Amino acid sequence: RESVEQQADSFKATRFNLETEWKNNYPRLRELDRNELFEKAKNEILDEVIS
Amino acid sequence: RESVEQQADSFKATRFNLETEWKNNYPRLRELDRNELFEKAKNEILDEVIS
Structure with a gap:
């Protein structure tokens, strides 16, 4: 109890x-x-494909 | 076989x-x-929160 309060x-x-x-x-x-970063990265890739 | 070719x-x-x-x-x-539209919509919402 004492230790967990300090932690x-x-x-x-x-x-x-x-x-x-x-x-x-x-x-x-x-x-x-x-x-989530992988999902964001792939969406940017698809956008560049369209562009 | 004949029908599937036409279809x-x-x-x-x-x-x-x-x-x-x-x-x-x-x-x-x-x-x-x-x-995928749901995922795109939520990301836009988070962007507007940051903006």
Whole structure:
């Protein structure tokens, strides 16, 4: 119980730092996982094929 | 055997007419099914959220 409280606060702070870095570097972008990036990449490829 | 040959030619001609209509109406667009349109629509929504 004592350990998990400390870990939860540390994890929340760590996640906040990661989010702050994302905003500072990529404020106008959206975070996507590996699968979603693959879907976005293929759609762009199809657009270039049409263009 | 005789019937399927006639049907295959008719289906090919029918598909050609549908493709010709697509080019005449939407030459610069890509045909997508119901699922793919849903994926495209949600991505546009996320873009508007960021904008």
